[PDB]
Design a protein around this ligand. Structure first.
Ligand code: MG
Ligand code: MG
Ligand code: MG
Ligand code: MG
Ligand code: MG
Lengths: 226, 195, 250, 204, 244, 241, 231, 196, 243
C-alpha cells in the first residue's frame, strides 16, 4: 500500500494506489483505499484493511451524530481526537494506520495517525509499504505555496513511485482534492497506467465440455398461493 | 476414551464402543459403557478427555429428558444432533472447552428412517451412513467403503462391524478390550450381549 | 441516593384508562399546530414558529429536524421532550441500523424505533410518558414516500395527510377536501400553507413559519462529488425567502 | 493446528452478462482423513447466495446465524435482503468478533432485484470487503483458483458459457489441492431462475 | 421516600384477583374485535380497525394482524405499542428455536413463552402489565392447525373458534351457533365476516375498516402459505360473501 | 394529589414541579441583563449584600465556565453552583473528546437536555435556576443562550431575567425596534457595558453605585468579570453625558 | 404524626421522630450503671428475666481485653454494634499494633449510627450503650445514644428508672473519682448507685451483673456467685 | 530524542530536537515535542509517542478543569498530575516527561518525571536518548541565574552536541521561553547549530 | 398540601420545606461563632454542661480538616461529624492529585455541593447543621458559613445556633469599630466575650468555652486549639466584660 497527503495553497490533497494483497497474492486489483469520514474529511488507510475500514466507519458515524448535535460542520481535529483515543485504548491491537485530511470552518488540515494512538502534523506525509518510495519523491519536489494543480501532480507522482517500486503497491492512482470553500472532489482511478494486454488465446469452452451428474431447478421464490 | 464406531443400515443404527478405561500405566476397567440414552429412540456414544466425556453426555441427557417431559414429545434425531452441535460450538470458545467427540444414532419415528450423526468437539456435524472418531476411521473406512450397502439388514451390519473390529484388533497397538454393541431401531434401544 | 422509583408511574385505572398517557395527549392538544401532506413525488411537513419573545432569535430553535438524509420530523407538544427524542432517534438510526447494514433505515422502521422508546417511557420504572406527538416524513428505495404519526403511547399510523396539536380537528377537515392521489409536491406545499394560515393568529411569513420537504435528491447539498450512486439528501428545509415567494401565489 | 485448513474446501464466484455464478467443492475432512463428500458450502437467503470456506463448525454456525438475521430482517423490512445490504451485514457480524474471530472465508453472490445488476463480494475472516467486478475466490486452494480465474475469465459471458468457465476453474484448482474435491456444485443465477448442477470429478 | 408514590401493580385484591390484570382486560374490551376460526383445511383471521379516516394510508397500515414467522401469525386486541414489544420478542424466540434445533418452533411452545413473559409482569418487578390480548393462528406437523389466545394474566387456551376485543360475548355466541367441525376455510371466511358484520359498532362493514388473513395448506402440495389480504382483496371477498 | 409532588402529568397535561421550580428562580430578588456588541457579549446583574458580616467579594452569581464561556444564574446559590460545576465539567470533557472548545449554544443544549431529564425522571428534582450562557463564538460570533427548568433553550439578540424581567425586556425591545439591527453597533466593550447599565437604570428606575452591580464581559478567546473599580469608571462615564 | 413514617423526614419543628421512638426503646430497657475512678472503670447492670423458669438476659458484652460495654434496649442491635466495635478494636491491633482509644471508639459508633438516620429504607438502632475502657490516657466511660450522640462522662446510667442512679452519682462525684487502687470499693459505689433505681425487686445472685477494667485488670464480667460478695 | 528545560533569572526555557524515528527510518523530521498543557506550563516528551500524547492530553484536560474551579494551577500541581498518571500506570506506560512552568510567586520551575513515575525538582533537567551524551557538558556549563541570551546559548550548544552523537535525535532545535512577559517560540536550523 | 412531607419537592411558593425544617434543628442547637482576623481565623463554641458528671474539656466539638482548616457547627452533632468526614475525604483526594493542600474556597464548594446533593432526592434527608469553617491558604485567611440548603458565602464574622442574633450584633460592632482589622490574639479575646454574651439565650444551665484558631503569625497557618493560660486569659477577659 502507498498513501500520501499533500497541503497546498487553498486546501489539501490525498492519494492512494489500488492494490490489496493477502501475502504475495493480489486479492483485488482495483481496491478503494480513500475513505470518507465526512463530506469534506477524507482519509486513506494502511495496515489491517478491516480495521481501517471499521475505524473509519465508526468515527464517521459518531462525527455525523456530533455534527447534527452541534449544528456545525465536522472538524478534522475532532476526527483526529476520536480516532487516536479509540486506537490508544486498544493498545495497537486495532492495526489502523491512517492519513487524515480535510477542510472545515477552521481551515485545511493534514494529520497522520498510528495504530498505538500517536498522531503527527505535516505539510506532506506518506504511509504504507511504499511510503519510503513516496517520501523520496515528496522530499525531492515539495515546496511551500504549491498550487492545486502542482499538488495533485506531486501526490500522484508519489503514488506512482510506490506503484512501480513497491511490490505491496500497484495498479491505479486514486485522488481526492479538498479545497476551502468548495465541494471535495473524489477522483476515482485518476490514473490508469496498468491495463492488462490482450491475451494470446480465447479460453471460451465448447458447450457440453463439463461432465454433469444431475440438474435441478432451485426454488428461490416464496411459498406460492392456491 | 478410544474407539467408537457407527453404521446406519436399512432399518436401524448400530453403535460400537470400546470397553477399556486406561489411566496412564494401568487398565482400570474392561467393561465400561461409553454411551447414554438421550431418548427412547436416540443413543449417543462418546470419546475424549477423561471426566469431560461423562459430564457432557449426562448434561445432554438431562436436557433432552427435560424437553421430553415439558412437551410430552420425543425430539427427532436431527433436532437432538443440532442441539448437541450448538453446545459443542459454544464450548469451543469457552474458558475451558469440552474435549468430547460424539456419535448420535437415532431412529426417526416420523420418517421411519434410521439416522447417524458424527459430531466432533469443535461442533463439526455431518450425517453419514457410517462414521467414527479418532484413529478408528483410518482402519475401518476402507472395509466400510467396500462392503456397505444402504439396503443391508441388521444382521449384515453386525457382520460388517465384526470385520471392522477384527481389523482394529489386528493393526491397532492399544488393547481396547473389545466393544459393547447397541442397536437403535423402531422398537427402541437394545444391547447385543454376545460380541 | 440511587433511583428508588423502580415501579411504574403509569398504571391502568378501574375503567381501563392509562391516565398518564391520556394526560400526555392533553399536553399535545395544547401544543402549536403542525401538519404533513404526502404528494406523488414528495412529502411536506410544516409548523408555526411560535416565538416566546421578540428578543429571542427563533432561527436558533428548530422545530423541524433532520433525522436522516431522507427522513425529517416535526412535533406538537412539549419542545424539550421533542429535542431529546430527536437526539435518540438520530443515534438509534445509526446504532440499530446503519452500523449493521451500511445504509440508513427505511422510514417505517425508524418510526418503529422511536415508537419503542416512547412505549418504554409508558411502562418502565420511575418515568413519565413523552408529552409529544411526532409527524415523521421520509423516503426510501423500496417503500417510496411515506408519512407517519407517533403518539405518547408509542402507537404509530401512516397518513396520506394529517395534522396534530391546537387546531388539528379543523385542519384535518380542510385537508380531506383538498387531498387527492394526483398531487404534485408544489400543490402539497400550497395546500400546506393554506391549511396552516387558519391556525395562525399573528404574523404569517417565512420568518414565522417553518417548512421542510422530502423530495428529489439534492446533489448540491451532498458536499462532495465523484461517487455516482451518492446523489444527495432528499430532506430539504425551505428558506424564509422560498416560503415568501409561494405566499404571493397564495 | 491452523484453524482455516483443518477441514479444507473452496468457493469461487463469477459475474457474467445479466447473471452470476457461485461454486464450491463438497469435501469435509479431519486433516488427512476424508470424512464427508456431501458437505455443501453454499447457502441462500432468498435470492442472495453465501459461500463459506474454512473451519466447518464456524461455517455451520454462520449459516445458522445469517438465516437467523435475514429472517428477522424480512419480517421487519417486509422484503428480501439484497446482495449489497447482506454484504455489509456479513462484514459487521464478522468484525464484532475482532479479537475472537470465526475462522472463515465468506463469499457473497447475487443479482439486485430492483436494478438487475450482478453482484459478488469476498471477505477475510475479520470482515474486510473485497468487491471485485470479475471474480472472488476463497479456501485452501485460493492460490490455484486465482491462477485459473485470471486466465480463464473474460467479461460478459452468457450463463451457459459462464458455467463452463467457473466449473473448469473449480475442478482444476481442486485437483491441485489435497484438502479439496470429493465432488462439486455450481449455481447459475439469473434474475428469476437459478440452476444447480453437480459435477463429475475424480474422487481422490 | 419513594414508597409513597408506588401503586403496587402486582398485588391481590381481598377477593384474590389481580387489580391491574382486571383493569387491563377492561381496556382490551374497548379495542377493535378480532376473530379466529379454525377449519380442517386452514385457519382464518379477521379483525376490525378502530374508527378510521379517509386520509389514513391503508395499504401500508398494520395495527391488527402480524406475522411471527412463515407458519404462525397473530391478531392483536389492545395497545398496539405494547403488542409490538411482545411481537418482536416472539419473533426472536422463534428464530432462537430454529437455530437451536433446526426445526420450526411448534405453535404451543411459542405461545407458552409469550404467555410466561406476560405472567412475570403480574408477579414481580412492580411494572404495569401489557394491555394486550393475542389470537395465535399457526401450523406445525404435530397438531396441525391450531388457534390459541393469551391475555394480560399470562393465561392461554386453545380454540376451534374465538374472539377478542369488543363485543366478545355477542361474537362468541354467534360463532358457537354456526360453527361445525367438518367446516372448510371458504365457509370459515364467510362466518368470520358475517360475525363481524353483526357485532360491529360501526354503521356498515367496509374494506377500509378490516384486516384479513388466512393460513392454508392451499400452498402447492405439502406446505403452508400465509396470506395477508390487500385492501382490494378484502373488498372482493366482501362482495363474494354478499356483505357489500 | 401526588401529581403535584413529582414530575408526572396533571389532568391538564401540566408539570407542577417544573412550574414551581420557575418560581424558586426569583427567590434571590435579583435581575440580570445580557446584550451583544459587534465584537463582544456583555452580561450585567444586580448585586445585593444585605449583611454587613458578609465578605462582599465572595457574593456572586456570575461564573467563568470556560475560558470563552461565561454564565449568569437567576435562582438560589446552591442550585446555581450545582449547575456551574456541571457546566465546567461538561465543557472540559467536550474539549478533551472532540479537540475544540465547546460552543456556547452546544453547552446550553447539553444543560437543557439534563434539565429535560429531571422533568421526566421522578427521582430527580428540577434545579430552581435559569442559566444565561454568553460568549463570542468562533463560528457564530457574539452569542446569548438561555436555559430554564423546563429544559427549554433558545438564542437571543438580547435578554433579561428576574422579578422585573418584563420592564427590562420591553425597554430592550423598543431600542432594537428603532435601530433595526440585532446588536449594539459599538466598537469597544466598555461602551457596550455602558449601554447595558444605562438601559437597566432606565428600565428599573434605580441608580447604581459600584457595589450594586456585577458585570461579565465576553470577547474573542476570553470571558472575564469586572472589578468594582472597573465598574466605577463605567458609572463615571455614564454620568458625564 | 405525619412526619414519623420514616427516618428521612424532619418535622416542622426540626425533629426526627423515628430517632425519638428508637430513644424510647432504651427507656423501656432494664437499668445499667457506669462509673470510673482514675485507675479503674466499672459497669453494673440489672438483668431482666422473662419469668421464673427463664434465664436473666445478659447485659454486658466484651469488645477487647481493654474495652467493653453494657446495653439497654434492643439486644440484637447491641450485638450488631458490639460486633462492629470488636472488629474496629481488632483492625487497630492487627494493622497498627495499637489498642483502640476509647474516645476514637465512640467516634466510630457515632458515625455508624448516623448513617441509619439520614437514609431511606433503613431504621435507627434501638439500643443505648455504656462503654468503659482503659487505654493510654487512663480510665474512660462513654454513653452512646442511637441518635449518634456519644458523650464522655465520670459516671452515668441508662434504662428504666435510671434518673435515681444518675442523681446519686452526681452527689457522690467527688468521692468515687478518688477511689484509686481499690476495685472492690469502686464496685460497691456502683452497686449502691444502681440500688437507687430499684423498686419492689432487689439485687439477687442471678439478677446482678458487674464488669470491671483498669490499670492491671483485663475487661472481666462477673455473674452468679461471683457477685454474692457485693449483695 | 533530545529534550531539556533550564531555569534562569527571568523564568524557564524548554528545548527539543524534531526527529521521530521508527527504527532507522525518520518518520517525522519536523516534530514538535514541546507541548502546552497550560498557558505558562509546558512539557517535553520522551518515550512512546502514543503514551506521552495520551498523558499530555489528559493533563491538559485536568488543568483546564482545575483552572475553571480554582484558578491558575502551580507548576508543582501540574507535575503532580503528570506523576499520578505515570506512577499508577507504570506497568502499561513508557513515558519520560520534563515539566516546566512560570509562576509570578515561584518564578521558573523544572520537574523531571522518569520511567518509574518519581518526581524530581531540579534547576535544570535533561532527558531522551540523546541526553546521555551531554551529562558532562551540561554539568560543566550550567550556572544559576543566567540571562535569557545565555540560557538560549546553553540549550542551543547542549542539544547541538546531543544531535551530533545521537542518531535518534536531529532536525531543527525548537525552544519555548516562559517569562512574565509571555510565551515566545524559537526555532534554530541545522546550518546554524551544526557550525557551533 | 403534603409538599412538606417529602424532600426535594417544590411547594407552590418554590420552597423546599424539608430544608426549612432542617434549619429549625440548627436554631435549636448551641451557639457557635467564627471571626476573621488580620492573618487568620478564630472559632468558638458554647458547650452546655448538662450534668456535673460530664468530664471537663473532654467532649471536644470543634474539628480539624487536613492541618489548616477548622470546622464548627450547631444543630445535630452527628450530622456535623458526617459532613466533616466527607470534607476530610475531599481534602485528601485534592491533595493526592494536586499536591498542594486544598484552598479554603475550593474546600467550601466541596462541602456545598455535598450538602446541596442532599436536597435533590426524597431518599435522603437534609443536613441538620449549619457549619462555620475556614483557615489559611496561599491567598490568605478565609471564613465561611454553610447552611442546610447547601448555600454558603464568605464572611468577616459568622454565628449560628440559639444565640445567633446576640452574637451577630456583637460581630457587627467589631466590623464597624475595626475597619483596619483585628489581631489574632484580639480575636480570641473577642470570641470568648461573644460566646459569654450569647449564653444569655441558654442561661438555665452553665457552659464550657472552647476556642480554636489558625493564624499565619501565631500558629504558622495550622489549626490549633486554644489551651491553658491563653484560654484562661480569654475567659477572664470575657468574665470582666459581662460584669
Ligand atoms: Mg483434490
Ligand atoms: Mg486422496
Ligand atoms: Mg423530576
Ligand atoms: Mg503503550
Ligand atoms: Mg542526529
Amino acid at each position: 500500500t502507498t498513501i500520501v497527503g499533500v497541503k497546498f495553497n487553498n486546501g489539501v490533497v490525498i492519494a492512494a494506489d489500488t492494490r490489496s494483497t493477502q501475502g504475495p497474492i493480489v486479492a483485488d486489483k482495483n481496491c478503494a483505499k480513500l475513505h470518507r469520514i465526512s463530506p469534506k474529511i477524507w482519509c486513506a488507510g494502511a495496515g489491517t484493511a478491516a480495521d481501517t475500514e471499521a475505524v473509519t466507519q465508526l468515527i464517521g458515524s459518531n462525527i455525523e451524530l456530533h455534527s447534527l448535535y452541534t449544528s456545525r460542520e465536522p472538524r478534522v481535529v475532532s476526527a483526529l481526537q476520536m480516532l487516536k483515543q479509540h486506537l490508544f485504548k486498544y493498545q495497537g491491537h486495532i492495526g489502523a494506520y491512517l492519513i487524515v485530511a480535510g477542510v472545515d470552518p477552521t481551515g485545511s488540515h493534514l494529520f497522520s495517525i498510528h495504530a498505538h494512538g500517536s498522531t503527527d502534523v505535516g505539510y506532506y506525509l506518506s504511509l504504507g509499504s511504499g511510503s519510503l518510495a513516496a517520501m523520496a519523491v515528496l522530499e525531492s519536489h515539495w515546496k511551500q505555496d504549491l498550487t492545486k494543480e502542482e499538488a495533485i501532480k506531486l501526490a500522484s507522482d508519489a503514488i506512482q513511485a510506490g506503484i512501480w517500486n513497491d511490490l505491496g503497491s500497484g495498479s491505479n492512482v486514486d485522488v481526492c482534492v479538498m479545497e476551502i470553500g468548495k465541494d471535495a472532489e473524489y477522483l476515482r482511478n485518476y490514473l490508469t497506467p496498468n491495463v492488462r494486454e490482450e491475451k494470446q488465446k480465447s479460453y471460451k469452452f465448447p458447450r457440453g465440455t463439463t461432465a454433469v451428474l444431475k440438474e435441478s431447478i432451485v426454488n428461490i421464490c416464496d411459498i406460492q398461493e392456491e | 476414551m478410544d474407539i467408537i464406531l457407527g453404521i446406519r443400515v436399512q432399518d436401524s443404527v448400530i453403535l460400537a464402543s470400546s470397553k477399556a478405561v486406561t489411566r496412564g500405566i494401568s487398565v482400570l476397567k474392561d467393561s465400561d459403557d461409553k454411551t447414554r440414552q438421550l431418548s427412547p429412540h436416540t443413543l449417543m456414544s462418546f470419546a475424549g478427555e477423561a471426566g469431560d466425556t461423562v459430564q457432557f453426555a449426562e448434561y445432554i441427557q438431562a436436557n433432552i429428558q427435560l424437553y421430553s417431559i415439558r412437551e410430552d414429545y420425543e425430539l427427532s434425531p436431527q433436532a437432538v444432533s443440532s442441539f448437541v452441535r450448538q453446545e459443542l460450538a459454544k464450548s469451543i470458545r469457552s474458558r475451558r472447552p469440552y474435549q468430547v467427540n460424539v456419535l448420535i444414532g437415532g431412529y426417526d419415528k416420523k420418517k421411519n428412517k434410521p439416522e447417524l450423526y458424527q459430531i466432533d468437539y469443535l461442533g463439526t456435524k455431518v450425517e453419514l451412513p457410517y462414521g467414527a472418531h479418532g484413529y478408528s476411521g483410518f482402519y475401518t473406512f476402507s472395509l466400510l467403503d467396500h462392503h456397505y450397502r444402504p439396503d443391508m439388514t441388521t444382521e449384515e451390519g453386525l457382520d460388517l462391524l465384526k470385520l471392522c473390529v477384527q481389523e482394529l484388533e489386528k493393526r491397532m497397538p492399544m488393547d481396547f478390550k473389545g466393544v459393547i454393541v447397541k442397536i437403535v431401531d423402531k422398537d427402541g434401544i437394545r444391547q447385543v450381549d454376545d460380541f | 441516593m440511587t433511583d428508588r422509583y423502580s415501579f411504574s408511574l403509569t398504571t391502568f385505572s378501574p375503567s381501563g384508562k392509562l391516565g398518564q398517557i391520556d394526560y400526555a395527549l392533553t399536553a399535545v392538544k395544547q401544543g402549536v399546530t403542525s401538519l404533513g401532506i404526502k404528494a406523488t413525488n414528495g412529502v411536506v411537513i410544516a409548523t408555526e414558529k411560535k416565538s416566546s419573545s421578540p428578543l429571542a432569535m427563533s432561527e436558533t430553535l428548530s422545530k423541524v429536524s433532520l433525522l436522516t438524509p431522507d427522513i425529517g420530523a416535526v412535533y406538537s407538544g412539549m419542545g424539550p421532550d421533542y429535542r431529546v427524542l430527536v437526539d435518540k432517534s438520530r443515534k438509534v438510526a445509526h446504532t440499530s441500523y446503519k452500523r449493521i447494514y451500511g445504509e440508513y433505515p427505511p422510514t417505517k422502521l425508524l418510526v418503529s424505533e422511536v415508537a419503542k422508546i416512547m412505549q418504554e417511557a409508558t411502562q418502565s420504572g420511575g418515568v413519565r410518558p413523552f408529552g409529544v406527538s411526532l409527524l415523521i416524513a421520509g423516503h426510501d428505495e423500496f417503500n417510496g414516500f411515506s408519512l407517519y404519526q407517533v403518539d405518547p403511547s408509542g402507537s404509530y399510523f401512516p397518513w396520506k395527510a394529517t395534522a396534530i396539536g391546537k387546531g388539528s380537528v379543523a385542519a384535518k377537515t380542510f385537508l380531506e377536501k383538498r387531498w387527492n392521489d394526483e398531487l404534485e409536491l408544489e400543490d402539497a406545499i400550497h395546500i400546506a400553507l393554506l391549511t396552516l394560515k387558519e391556525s395562525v393568529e399573528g404574523e404569517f411569513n417565512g420568518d414565522t413559519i417553518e417548512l421542510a420537504i422530502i423530495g428529489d435528491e439534492n446533489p448540491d447539498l451532498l458536499g462532495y462529488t465523484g461517487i455516482p450512486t451518492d446523489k444527495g439528501p432528499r430532506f430539504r428545509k425551505l428558506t424564509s425567502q422560498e416560503i415568501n415567494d409561494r405566499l404571493e401565489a397564495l | 493446528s491452523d484453524p482455516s485448513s483443518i477441514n479444507g474446501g473452496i468457493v469461487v464466484a463469477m459475474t457474467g452478462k445479466d447473471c452470476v455464478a457461485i461454486a464450491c467443492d463438497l469435501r469435509l475432512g479431519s486433516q488427512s482423513l476424508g470424512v464427508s463428500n456431501k458437505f455443501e458450502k453454499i447457502f441462500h437467503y432468498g435470492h442472495v447466495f453465501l459461500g463459506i470456506t474454512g473451519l466447518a463448525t464456524d461455517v455451520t454456525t454462520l449459516n445458522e446465524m445469517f438465516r437467523y438475521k435475514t429472517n428477522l430482517y424480512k419480517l421487519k423490512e417486509e422484503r428480501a435482503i439484497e446482495p449489497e445490504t447482506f454484504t455489509q451485514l456479513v462484514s459487521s457480524s464478522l468484525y464484532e468478533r475482532r479479537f475472537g474471530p470465526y475462522f472463515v472465508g465468506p463469499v457473497v453472490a447475487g443479482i439486485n432485484s430492483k436494478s438487475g445488476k450482478p453482484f459478488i463480494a469476498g471477505f477475510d475472516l475479520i470482515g474486510c470487503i473485497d468487491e471485485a467486478k470479475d471474480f472472488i475466490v476463497s479456501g485452501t486452494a485460493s492460490d490455484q483458483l486465482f491462477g485459473m480465474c485470471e486466465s480463464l475469465y473474460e467479461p460478459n459471458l452468457e450463463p451457459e458459457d459462464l458455467f463452463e468457465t467457473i466449473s473448469q476453474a473449480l475442478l482444476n484448482a481442486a485437483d491441485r489441492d489435497a484438502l479439496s474435491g470429493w465432488g462439486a456444485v455450481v449455481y447459475i443465477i439469473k434474475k428469476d431462475e437459478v440452476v444447480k448442477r453437480y459435477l463429475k470429478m475424480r474422487q481422490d | 421516600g419513594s414508597r409513597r408514590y408506588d401503586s403496587r401493580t402486582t398485588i391481590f385484591s381481598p377477593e384474590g384477583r389481580l387489580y391491574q390484570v382486571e383493569y387491563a382486560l377492561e381496556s382490551i374490551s374497548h379495542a377493535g374485535t378480532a376473530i379466529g376460526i379454525m377449519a380442517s383445511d386452514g385457519i382464518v383471521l379477521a379483525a376490525e380497525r378502530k374508527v378510521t379516516s379517509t386520509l389514513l394510508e391503508q395499504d401500508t397500515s398494520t395495527e391488527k394482524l402480524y406475522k411471527l414467522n412463515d407458519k404462525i401469525a397473530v391478531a392483536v386486541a389492545g395497545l398496539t405499542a405494547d403488542a409490538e414489544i411482545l411481537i418482536n420478542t416472539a419473533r426472536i424466540h422463534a428464530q432462537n428455536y430454529l437455530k437451536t434445533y433446526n426445526e420450526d418452533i411448534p405453535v404451543e411452545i411459542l405461545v407458552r413463552r409469550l404467555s410466561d413473559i406476560k405472567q412475570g409482569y403480574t408477579q414481580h418487578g412492580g411494572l404495569r402489565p401489557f394491555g394486550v390480548s393475542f389470537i395465535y393462528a399457526g401450523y406445525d406437523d404435530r397438531y396441525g392447525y391450531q388457534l390459541y389466545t393469551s391475555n394480560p394474566s399470562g393465561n392461554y387456551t386453545g380454540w376451534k373458534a374465538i374472539s377478542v376485543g369488543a363485543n366478545t360475548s355477542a361474537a362468541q355466541t354467534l360463532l358457537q351457533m354456526d360453527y361445525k367441525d367438518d367446516m372448510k376455510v371458504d365457509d370459515a371466511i364467510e362466518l368470520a365476516l358475517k360475525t363481524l358484520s353483526k357485532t360491529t359498532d360501526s354503521s356498515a362493514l367496509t374494506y377500509d375498516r378490516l384486516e384479513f388473513a388466512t393460513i392454508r395448506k392451499g400452498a402447492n402440495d405439502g406446505e403452508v402459505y400465509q396470506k395477508i389480504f390487500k385492501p382490494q382483496e378484502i373488498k372482493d371477498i366482501l362482495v363474494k360473501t354478499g356483505i357489500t | 394529589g401526588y401529581d403535584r409532588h413529582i414530575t408526572i402529568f396533571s389532568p391538564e397535561g401540566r408539570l407542577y414541579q417544573v412550574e414551581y421550580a420557575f418560581k424558586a428562580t426569583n427567590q434571590t430578588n435579583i435581575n440580570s441583563l445580557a446584550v451583544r456588541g459587534k465584537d463582544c457579549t456583555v452580561v450585567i446583574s444586580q448585586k445585593k449584600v444585605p449583611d454587613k458580616l458578609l465578605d462582599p467579594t465572595t457574593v456572586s452569581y456570575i461564573f467563568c465556565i470556560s475560558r470563552t464561556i461565561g454564565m449568569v444564574v437567576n435562582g438560589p446559590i446552591p442550585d446555581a453552583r450545582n449547575a456551574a460545576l456541571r457546566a465546567k465539567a461538561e465543557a472540559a470533557e467536550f474539549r478533551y473528546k472532540y479537540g475544540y472548545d465547546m460552543p456556547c449554544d452546544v453547552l446550553a443544549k447539553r444543560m437543557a437536555n439534563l434539565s429535560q431529564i429531571y422533568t421526566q425522571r421522578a427521582y430527580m428534582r428540577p434545579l430552581g435556576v435559569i442559566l444565561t450562557f454568553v460568549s463570542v463564538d468562533e463560528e457564530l460570533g457574539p452569542s446569548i443562550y438561555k436555559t430554564d427548568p423546563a429544559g427549554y433553550y433558545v438564542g437571543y439578540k438580547a435578554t433579561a431575567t428576574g422579578p422585573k424581567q418584563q420592564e427590562i425586556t420591553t425597554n430592550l425591545e423598543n431600542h432594537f425596534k428603532k435601530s433595526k439591527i440585532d446588536h449594539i453597533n459599538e466598537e469597544s466593550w466598555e461602551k457596550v457595558v455602558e449601554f447595558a447599565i444605562t438601559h437597566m437604570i432606565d428600565a428599573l428606575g434605580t441608580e447604581f453605585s459600584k457595589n450594586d452591580l456585577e458585570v461579565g464581559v465576553a470577547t474573542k478567546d476570553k470571558f472575564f468579570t469586572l472589578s468594582a473599580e472597573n465598574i466605577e469608571e463605567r458609572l463615571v462615564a455614564i454620568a458625564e453625558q | 404524626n405525619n412526619y414519623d413514617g420514616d427516618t428521612v423526614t424532619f418535622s416542622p419543628t426540626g425533629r426526627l421522630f423515628q430517632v425519638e421512638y428508637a430513644l424510647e426503646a432504651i427507656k423501656q430497657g432494664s437499668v445499667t450503671v457506669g462509673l470510673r475512678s482514675n485507675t479503674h472503670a466499672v459497669l453494673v447492670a440489672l438483668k431482666r428475666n422473662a419469668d421464673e423458669l427463664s434465664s436473666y438476659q445478659k447485659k454486658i458484652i466484651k469488645c477487647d481485653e481493654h474495652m467493653g460495654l453494657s446495653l439497654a434496649g434492643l439486644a440484637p442491635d447491641a450485638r450488631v454494634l458490639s460486633n462492629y466495635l470488636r472488629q474496629q478494636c481488632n483492625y487497630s491491633s492487627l494493622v497498627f499494633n495499637r489498642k483502640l482509644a476509647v474516645e476514637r471508639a465512640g467516634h466510630l459508633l457515632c458515625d455508624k449510627a448516623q448513617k441509619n438516620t439520614q437514609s431511606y429504607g433503613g431504621r435507627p438502632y434501638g439500643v443505648g450503650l455504656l462503654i468503659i475502657g482503659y487505654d493510654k490516657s487512663g480510665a474512660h466511660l462513654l454513653e452512646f445514644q442511637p441518635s449518634g450522640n456519644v458523650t464522655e462522662l465520670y459516671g452515668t446510667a441508662i434504662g428504666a428508672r435510671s434518673q435515681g442512679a444518675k442523681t446519686y452519682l452526681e452527689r457522690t462525684l467527688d468521692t468515687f473519682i478518688k477511689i484509686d487502687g481499690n476495685p472492690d470499693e469502686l464496685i460497691k459505689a456502683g452497686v449502691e448507685a444502681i440500688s437507687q433505681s430499684l423498686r419492689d425487686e432487689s439485687l439477687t445472685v442471678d439478677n446482678l451483673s458487674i464488669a470491671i477494667v483498669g490499670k492491671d485488670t483485663p475487661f472481666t464480667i462477673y455473674d452468679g456467685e461471683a457477685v454474692a460478695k457485693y449483695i | 530524542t533530545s529534550i531539556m528545560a533550564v531555569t534562569f533569572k527571568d523564568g524557564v526555557i524548554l528545548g527539543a530536537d524534531s526527529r521521530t524515528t521508527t527504527g532507522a527510518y525518520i518518520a517525522n523530521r519536523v516534530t514538535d515535542k514541546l507541548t502546552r498543557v497550560h498557558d505558562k506550563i509546558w512539557c517535553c516528551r520522551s518515550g512512546s509517542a502514543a503514551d506521552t500524547q495520551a498523558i499530555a492530553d489528559i493533563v491538559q484536560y485536568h488543568l483546564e478543569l482545575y483552572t475553571s474551579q480554582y484558578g491558575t494551577p502551580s507548576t508543582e500541581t501540574a507535575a503532580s498530575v503528570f506523576k499520578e498518571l505515570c506512577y499508577e500506570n507504570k506497568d502499561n506506560l513508557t513515558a519520560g516527561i520534563i515539566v516546566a512552568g512560570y509562576d509570578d510567586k515561584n518564578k521558573g520551575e523544572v520537574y523531571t518525571i522518569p520511567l518509574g513515575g518519581s518526581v524530581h525538582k531540579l534547576p535544570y533537567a535533561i532527558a531522551g536518548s540523546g541526553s546521555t551524551f551531554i551529562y558532562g557538558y551540561c554539568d560543566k556549563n550550567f550556572r544559576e541565574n543566567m540571562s535569557k541570551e545565555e540560557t538560549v546559548d546553553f540549550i542551543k550548544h547542549s542539544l547541538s552536541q546531543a544531535i551530533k552523537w545521537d542518531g535518534s535525535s536531529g532536525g531543527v532545535i525548537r525552544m519555548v521561553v516562559l517569562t512574565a512577559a509571555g510565551v515566545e517560540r524559537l526555532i534554530f536550523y541545522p546550518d546554524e547549530y551544526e557550525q557551533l | 398540601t403534603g409538599y412538606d412531607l417529602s424532600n426535594s419537592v417544590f411547594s407552590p411558593d418554590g420552597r423546599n420545606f424539608q430544608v426549612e425544617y432542617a434549619v429549625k434543628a440548627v436554631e435549636n442547637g448551641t451557639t457557635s461563632i467564627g471571626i476573621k482576623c488580620n492573618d487568620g481565623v478564630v472559632f468558638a463554641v458554647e458547650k452546655l454542661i448538662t450534668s456535673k458528671l460530664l468530664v471537663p474539656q473532654k467532649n471536644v466539638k470543634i474539628q480539624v480538616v487536613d492541618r489548616h482548616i477548622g470546622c464548627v457547627y450547631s444543630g445535630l452533632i452527628p450530622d456535623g461529624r458526617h459532613l466533616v468526614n466527607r470534607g476530610r475525604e475531599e481534602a485528601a483526594s485534592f491533595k493526592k492529585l494536586y499536591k498542594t493542600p486544598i484552598p479554603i474556597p475550593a474546600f467550601a464548594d466541596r462541602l456545598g455541593q455535598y450538602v446541596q446533593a442532599h436536597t435533590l432526592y426524597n431518599s435522603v434527608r437534609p443536613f441538620g447543621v449549619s457549619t462555620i469553617f475556614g483557615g489559611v491558604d496561599k491567598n490568605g485567611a478565609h471564613l465561611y458559613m454553610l447552611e442546610p440548603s447547601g448555600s454558603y458565602w464568605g464572611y468577616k464574622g459568622a454565628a449560628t445556633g440559639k444565640g445567633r442574633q446576640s452574637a451577630k450584633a456583637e460581630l457587627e460592632k467589631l466590623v464597624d469599630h475595626h475597619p483596619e482589622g483585628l489581631s489574632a490574639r484580639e480575636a480570641v479575646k473577642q470570641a470568648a466575650k461573644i460566646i459569654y454574651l450569647a449564653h444569655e439565650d441558654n442561661k438555665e444551665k452553665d457552659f464550657e468555652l472552647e476556642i480554636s484558631w489558625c493564624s499565619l503569625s501565631e500558629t504558622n497557618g495550622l489549626h490549633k486549639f486554644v489551651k491553658g493560660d491563653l484560654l484562661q486569659e480569654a475567659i477572664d477577659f470575657a468574665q470582666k466584660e459581662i460584669n
